[PDB]
Design a protein around this ligand. Structure first.
Ligand SMILES: CC(=O)[C@H]1CC[C@H]2[C@@H]3CCC4=CC(=O)CC[C@]4(C)[C@H]3[C@H](OC(=O)CCC(=O)O)C[C@]12C
Lengths: 216, 219
């Protein structure tokens, strides 16, 4: 199968800047009939994709003047010129030259802003849950940029692996930030044979970890 | 208005098959192909097969053979996808696309039909309150939360103070833990509100007709 890869995974962009995604192929995209079938799609969220560019450099109908294809062989890039707010989405490139047509991973366009550090909070098990047999400790990592953040769950002096679950919010539209919540989960019993629990957040804005704890 | 219209979302349990429809209106059905594309959670757009309306013949990409059957009934401008012996792996959104014979692109996409395959039966959510565990605010503000745990299917509507607290709430996405979903939301208030004013989080779960208000109260 041709393996089309895209990079970056996300592109920080200030609306107004130019942008360039760059796809790439594990086989060439020039077809015996002479044509190259590299196509490019834009999937704005909770939607079905809309064709943008076909046959490397051709814009589809209506698709705005600010785009440009380029490349050959195995390297192609789509250039958006002065990003407007409606171009924001995942872009996928596709080869339609060798069966099966295959798809790239995508590149999400996202707004960039100043670094923010996460206001992180930890919460101990509600009593109505221990009452039934569990204890989920919950840490919320809120209102931080940029999107990579690593969360250690130090559960006794030591570090815990299992029972953590994470879930991120998308780029919060109002302030262009992110938010993360991990829920470490122990059996009621297994919670109460122990002292402190600490959610630990390691992230660009911090010299040294931004960590929170409770104990019993 | 030239669209490809697809049937609704389906919830189904292993084995059970599902016939997905894709109806064309607006254009000349016979002289374009109907390609089927799969978008599975945090996997790529896998191109599944194709059914050309001249020939009547399906090309499947045998990464999908024997379970998945493309059929069609042309006089009704409707192309169909059937999956048989549904496994858990199929939870995805299947789009049908109109593909073309000259430039080979896909240019009209259908809106998607998410199949969810599962074996949980409807469970109402246990809603639990998250309150500070007496941790004392760094800068003048408090963050309470709700933890909705162990429910099926989705959706769940978490609102705070019956819609009145919007900026500041962050309802995260549902995650599985054994068949059942867990999700939490958080509201950040001025510490001149909690515990002076009330803070209630209302989780509604229409699938089982349960709505559970939980007021957060000190800890
Ligand atoms: C209209 C349509 O569905 C399009 C969408 C993508 C296209 C296919 C993309 C894959 C492909 C690569 C090739 O170079 C061989 C032709 C095919 C296999 C294309 C088909 O052409 C063909 O010649 C096959 C049609 C036929 O002659 O039976 C038509 C397709 C499937």
């Amino acid at each position: 199968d041709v393996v089309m890869t895209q990079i970056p995974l996300s592109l920080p962009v200030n609306l107004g800047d130019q942008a360039s995604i760059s796809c790439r192929s594990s086989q060439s995209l020039i077809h015996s009939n002479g044509n190259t079938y590299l196509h490019w799609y834009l999937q704005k969220p909770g939607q079905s994709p809309k064709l943008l560019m076909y046959k490397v450099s051709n814009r589809f109908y209506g698709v705005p003047d600010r785009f440009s294809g380029s490349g050959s062989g195995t390297d192609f890039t789509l250039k958006i010129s002065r990003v407007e707010a409606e171009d924001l989405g995942i872009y996928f490139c596709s080869q339609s030259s060798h069966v099966p047509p295959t798809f790239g991973g995508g590149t999400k366009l996202e707004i960039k802003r100043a670094d923010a550090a996460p206001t992180v909070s930890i919460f101990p098990p509600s009593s109505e849950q221990l009452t039934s047999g569990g204890a989920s400790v919950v840490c919320f990592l809120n209102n931080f940029y940029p999107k990579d953040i690593n969360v250690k769950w130090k559960i006794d002096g030591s570090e815990r692996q299992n029972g953590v679950l994470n879930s991120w919010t998308d780029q919060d539209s109002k302030d262009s930030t992110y938010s993360m919540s991990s829920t470490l989960t122990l059996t009621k019993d297994e919670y109460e044979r122990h002292n402190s629990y600490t959610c630990e957040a390691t992230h660009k804005t911090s010299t040294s970890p931004i960590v929170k704890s409770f104990n019993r | 208005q030239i669209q490809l219209v697809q049937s609704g979302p389906e919830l189904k349990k292993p084995g059970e098959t599902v016939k997905i429809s894709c109806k064309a209106s607006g254009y000349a059905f016979t002289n374009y192909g109907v390609n089927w594309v799969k978008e599975a959670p945090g996997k790529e757009l896998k191109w599944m097969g194709w059914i050309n309306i001249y020939t009547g013949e399906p090309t499947y990409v045998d990464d999908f053979k024997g379970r998945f059957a493309f059929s069609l009934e042309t006089s009704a401008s409707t192309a169909y996808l059937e999956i048989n012996n549904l496994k858990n792996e199929d939870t995805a959104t299947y789009f049908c696309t109109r593909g073309d014979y000259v430039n080979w692109y896909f240019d009209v996409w259908g809106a998607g039909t998410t199949v969810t395959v599962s074996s949980a039966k409807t469970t109402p959510p246990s809603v639990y309150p998250l309150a500070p565990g007496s941790a004392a605010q760094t800068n003048s503000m408090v963050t309470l939360g709700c933890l909705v745990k162990g429910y099926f299917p989705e959706p769940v509507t978490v609102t705070w103070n019956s819609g009145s607290l919007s900026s500041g709430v962050h309802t995260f996405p549902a995650v599985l833990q054994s068949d059942l979903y867990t999700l939490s939301s958080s509201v950040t208030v001025p510490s001149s509100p909690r515990p002076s004013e009330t803070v209630t989080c209302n989780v509604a779960h229409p699938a089982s007709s349960t709505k559970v208000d939980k007021k957060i109260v000190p800890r």
